[PDB]
Amino acid sequence: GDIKSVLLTAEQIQARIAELGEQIGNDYREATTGQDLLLITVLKGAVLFVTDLARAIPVPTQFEFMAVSSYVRILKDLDRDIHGRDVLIVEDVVDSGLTLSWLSRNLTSRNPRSLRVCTLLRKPDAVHANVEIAYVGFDIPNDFVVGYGLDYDERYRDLSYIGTLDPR
Amino acid sequence: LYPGDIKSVLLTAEQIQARIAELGEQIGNDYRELSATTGQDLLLITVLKGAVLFVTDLARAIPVPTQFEFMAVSSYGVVRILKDLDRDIHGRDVLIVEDVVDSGLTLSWLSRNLTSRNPRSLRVCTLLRKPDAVHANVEIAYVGFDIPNDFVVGYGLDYDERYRDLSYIGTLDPR
Amino acid sequence: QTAELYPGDIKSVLLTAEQIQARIAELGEQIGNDYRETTGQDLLLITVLKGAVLFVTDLARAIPVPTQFEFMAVSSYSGVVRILKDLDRDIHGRDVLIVEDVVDSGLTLSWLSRNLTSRNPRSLRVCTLLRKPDAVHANVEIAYVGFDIPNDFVVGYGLDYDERYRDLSYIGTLDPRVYQ
Amino acid sequence: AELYPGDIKSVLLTAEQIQARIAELGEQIGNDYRELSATTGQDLLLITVLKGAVLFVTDLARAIPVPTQFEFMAVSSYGVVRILKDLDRDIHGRDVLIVEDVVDSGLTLSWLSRNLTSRNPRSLRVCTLLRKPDAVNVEIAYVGFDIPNDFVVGYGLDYDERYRDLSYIGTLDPRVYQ
Ligand SMILES: Nc1nc2c(ncn2C[C@@H](COCCP(=O)(O)O)OCCP(=O)(O)O)c(=O)[nH]1
Ligand SMILES: Nc1nc2c(ncn2C[C@@H](COCCP(=O)(O)O)OCCP(=O)(O)O)c(=O)[nH]1
Ligand SMILES: Nc1nc2c(ncn2C[C@H](COCCP(=O)(O)O)OCCP(=O)(O)O)c(=O)[nH]1
Ligand SMILES: Nc1nc2c(ncn2C[C@H](COCCP(=O)(O)O)OCCP(=O)(O)O)c(=O)[nH]1
Ligand SMILES: [Mg+2]
Ligand SMILES: [Mg+2]
Ligand SMILES: [Mg+2]
Ligand SMILES: [Mg+2]
Ligand SMILES: [Mg+2]
């Protein structure tokens, strides 16, 4: 056991995503454009979240993945052009907002019809900064959490729940 | 969700989740005390992006520590790598996670590509297996379902990049 | 047989090998003088695969100041394109020169110039070997132009048709019967 | 003039030594693939890994008196190689010539040769500009120069991504490594 405590249980998470699904599914239930809602996720923290979210949204949703390295270095771009598409960014953790800031700028330059953000977790300097997120799963404290996509050196991702890693 | 598009339902969400829980248990037993011996978690390798739905559910269903590795590919058995693995799988216990194995051509390339990286072991787990896979030559240790030779959609599987978000798997009607 | 690589495929030679290497030598001197300057970091040459590869090699050797190589790979989804291979390094605060083979519509250069400026380099200029008359419709300014050529489709010295004729030392108009 | 004044301690291979060797290699390669180009109907394929052999492949291709096509690969290390950019087309049944710049331990070539042969090309040979003593695993058909195990720069070869634009190959002044 390397988990200090369980922050968000698997039952809580699945219950919240079901709520997010309908909230999203009714902001996007009209179709008019003839094109499905596009979910864009950066590998690979929100992979667990986007697979559950897409199944929880009661409207047709399509998948788009991105792989980005650091020196803002694109290691795998979008498969198709998102021009005139309704795009929903699916993140796992928004803390400083730097990651979201870069991604949103990059996607907006591709000229989408709309662009909104859906993160599973939001830390407490993301609330002080008053970032603009359309959909927030949970408001968590500023402690390093793992599980449900989140990781520490590529581990604990397979956890059905979200717990806090013990500061050794 | 897709009115009139799905002709007949092949596999309900309930049945899919039940089989994966069974697969997870079986895989967990075979790789029991592998993290205690080697000191490294079981490595799940998945090709984007049809089996992403399946690998997320499977990883949670396996009672041993597992990690994720993704590959983005394209076609010219002839496969172009758009995004390679992030790490070196040398000496790692590797499980290939596929969505559907039909001709086995996709699998025969991936098996060869990964075995050239010299992993400690390499096995395959596919959710769906079609009858033509019997003519393939890559051994599959874990099979979710044996289905007939019909085009199915849902749970990751698609047709013109649609129906992926479906919670179940079903056949398609002339669309 | 003959010494000709593609007999009967070239309608007319637009530019010869020596004429090409002579202009590049001139461009090198011109570029070298502009970037003779003060920051410690070398001039950065950025070209997309794989038409201006032949050109950037000779150009970098023709420029009398230190030059570094950067390569990008892209693939159309017209003016919109995906990145198959990004820069290996961050060009922030770097003096960057876009090395292109042919500028016609300008759609290629327009996206690249806009993309490279979002990385915020110290300076960003464009050098193309060839320029067609349709390039005047674009809005991205070009500092160095080796040759202004007609609208006709040309090959050689990197330029291709179905991945052929790239290895030619000269540039010529492809015979119409090849692409018809 | 000198692009890097006071950085090169000595010249190993002058620009004309290199270009002269390339002409010899081009003629030699051209005659080996003389008759097996008009039979298949497809040109000779040059495959090169970025970025060290870019200068060498552009000069070599123009030195080969038969039609030659280009293919570039971008890689990274984690013998063990990560592909950043793969080949543009399928090389099944093609006549492939691997164009390298330097073969030392032979690990890089060992991976590439294995990777390309899995794509089932008709023929697969190797041409490197430079070869080091510890390259005595995978057969090399064409070698430009046999050089000592010292660290050299120029003509594609770099140190911290510099000195690639040199027309010659030489050794570096010890103060550069500071
Ligand atoms: N696992 C985990 N990762 C965390 C956490 N906080 C930030 N990160 C890093 C970052 C996500 O890191 C995932 C990158 P991967 O490990 O390569 O998939 O989230 C910061 C959001 P910000 O840019 O708006 O500040 C955390 O609590 N748990
Ligand atoms: N949606 C769907 N896709 C199918 C099916 N059969 C093969 N594929 C193609 C493929 C799975 O679908 C991948 C679609 P992509 O991710 O958009 O490229 O599996 C081929 C296995 P093989 O190489 O052994 O023949 C099917 O029944 N439904
Ligand atoms: N070989 C050849 N190619 C030409 C020509 N005109 C435009 N191109 C397309 C030229 C290269 O098109 C093929 C891409 P690659 O094979 O990777 O060089 O880029 C178009 C520039 P823009 O988007 O500003 O119009 C031509 O005359 N000959
Ligand atoms: N500058 C320089 N680089 C050298 C030298 N030897 C190997 N290299 C690196 C050479 C190429 O390394 C990649 C660097 P780059 O080609 O600049 O992207 O590896 C081949 C060695 P092996 O065949 O044993 O795998 C050398 O003497 N000088
Ligand atoms: Mg993330
Ligand atoms: Mg598959
Ligand atoms: Mg170009
Ligand atoms: Mg090399
Ligand atoms: Mg190097």
- Transcribe B56-70 into DSSP letters: HHHHHH-SS-EEEEE
D103 CA distance to ligand 8 middle (Å): 7
CA D127 to CA D166: how far, in whole Å?
Answer: 21
CA C163 to CA C176: how far, in whole Å?
Answer: 17
CA B17 to CA C165: how far, in whole Å?
Answer: 56
CA A143 to CA A164: how far, in whole Å?
Answer: 7
Task: Evaluate whether D47 touches D101 at the Cβ level (below 8 Å).
Answer: no
Task: Tell me the nearest-neighbour CA distance from B101 into chain A, angstroms.
Answer: 21
> Which entry of D7, D32, D43, D104 is annotated as an active-site residue?
D104
Would residue A81 show up in a list of annotated catalytic residues for this protein?
Answer: no
Task: Evaluate whether A122 touches A106 at the Cβ level (below 8 Å).
Answer: no
DSSP state letter for C165:
S
Classify residue C46 as exposed, middle or buried by CB count within 10 Å of its CB (0-12, 13-18, 19+).
buried
| Structural domains of chain D, count | 1
Q: 3-state DSSP call for residue A10?
A: helix
D165 to chain C, any CB pair closer than 8 A? The answer is yes
Of A35, A37, A32, the closest CA to residue A53 belongs to A37
Task: Evaluate whether D21 touches D14 at the Cβ level (below 8 Å).
Answer: no
CA A5 to CA C68: how far, in whole Å?
Answer: 51
Q: 3-state DSSP call for residue A17?
A: helix
A127 to chain B, any CB pair closer than 8 A? The answer is no
Q: Which two tokens stand for residue B162?
A: 């649609």
Classify residue C51 as exposed, middle or buried by CB count within 10 Å of its CB (0-12, 13-18, 19+).
buried
Q: Which residues of C touch D55 (CB under 8 A)?
A: 57, 61
CA D108 → CA A78, D100, D113, D137, distances in Å? 30, 10, 9, 11
Structural domain of residue C47, as residue ranges? 1-180
The sheet with strand A37-42 has its strands ordered as: A73-76, A61-69, A37-42, A86-94, A114-122, A135-139
Q: Which two tokens stand for residue D166?
A: 């040199």
CA C131 to CA C147: how far, in whole Å?
Answer: 6
Do strands D68-77 and D81-85 pair parallel, antiparallel, or not at all (unpaired)?
antiparallel
Q: 3-state DSSP call for residue A63?
A: strand
Are residues D85 and C89, on separate chains, in Cβ contact within 8 Å? Answer: no
Q: Which two tokens stand for residue C47?
A: 């070209």
For chain B, the first-to-last Cα distance in angstroms comes to 15
Q: Which residues of D touch C73 (CB under 8 A)?
A: 72, 74, 85
CA C5 to CA A85: how far, in whole Å?
Answer: 48
Helical residues (DSSP H) of A31-117, grouped into ranges = 47-56, 98-108
Of B87, B134, B75, B152, the closest CA to residue B114 belongs to B87
DSSP state letter for B132:
G
Tell me how the structure was determined: X-ray
What residue owns the CA closest to ligand 3's atom 24? C106
Spatial neighbors of B95 by CB under 8 A, at least 6 apart, are: B27, B42, B43, B44, B45, B122, B123, B124, B125
Beta strands in chain B (DSSP E): 6-11, 42-47, 66-75, 79-83, 93-101, 121-129, 142-146, 152-153, 169-172
CA C117 to CA A116: how far, in whole Å?
Answer: 25
Task: Evaluate whether C39 touches C95 at the Cβ level (below 8 Å).
Answer: yes
CA A164 to CA B5: how far, in whole Å?
Answer: 44
Q: Which two tokens stand for residue B110?
A: 């991936």
Task: Evaluate whether B67 touches B44 at the Cβ level (below 8 Å).
Answer: yes
Q: What angle do CA D123, D127, D128 make, to 5 degrees?
A: 155
| Cis previous bond, A4, omega within 30 | no
Task: Evaluate whether C150 touches C11 at the Cβ level (below 8 Å).
Answer: no
Classify residue B174 as exposed, middle or buried by CB count within 10 Å of its CB (0-12, 13-18, 19+).
exposed
For ligand 3, pick from C80, C109, C159 the residue to mutate: most ligand atoms within 8 Å of CB: C159
CA C95 to CA C36: how far, in whole Å?
Answer: 12
Beta bridge pairs of residue D126: D98
Q: Which two tokens stand for residue C94?
A: 């770097």
Pick left, alpha or beta for residue B60 (phi over 0 → left; psi -120 to 50 → alpha; otherwise beta).
Answer: alpha
Spatial neighbors of A108 by CB under 8 A, at least 6 apart, are: A115
| Cis previous bond, C85, omega within 30 | no
CA D151 to CA D169: how far, in whole Å?
Answer: 10
Q: Which two tokens stand for residue A103?
A: 């991604």
Compute how many other C-beta atoms are within 10 angstroms of the C-beta atom of residue D93. 12
Single-letter amino acid, residue D84: L
Task: Evaluate whether B155 touches B16 at the Cβ level (below 8 Å).
Answer: yes
Q: How far is CA D79 from the centre of its chain?
A: 17
CA D97 to CA C168: how far, in whole Å?
Answer: 18
Q: Which two tokens stand for residue B14?
A: 């309930």
Of A93, A99, A101, the closest CA to residue A142 belongs to A93
Compute how many other C-beta atoms are within 10 angstroms of the C-beta atom of residue D60. 26
CA C13 to CA C99: how far, in whole Å?
Answer: 23
Q: How far is CA C49 from the centre of its chain?
A: 10
CA C69 to CA D72: how far, in whole Å?
Answer: 14
Backbone phi, psi, residue C41, to 5°:
-95, 140
Give residues after which chain A gaps, C-N over 2.5 angstroms.
30, 71
Rg (CA), chain A: 16
Compute how many other C-beta atoms are within 10 angstroms of the C-beta atom of residue D41. 6
What residue owns the CA closest to ligand 3's atom 23? C108
Are residues B81 and D86, on separate chains, in Cβ contact within 8 Å? Answer: yes
Ligand 2 atom at shortest distance from the alpha carbon of B104: 24
Q: Which residue has the tokens 């710049």?
A: D101
The resolution of the experimental structure, rounded to one decimal in Å, is: 2.6
Task: Evaluate whether B74 touches B101 at the Cβ level (below 8 Å).
Answer: no
Q: What is the dihedral of CA C102, C106, C107, C110, to 10 degrees?
A: 110
Give residues after which chain D gaps, C-N over 2.5 angstroms.
78, 136
CA D91 to CA D70: how far, in whole Å?
Answer: 12
Give residues after which chain C gaps, C-N over 2.5 angstroms.
37, 77
CATH of the domain at B121: 3.40.50.2020
Chains A, C: CB pairs < 8 Å = 22
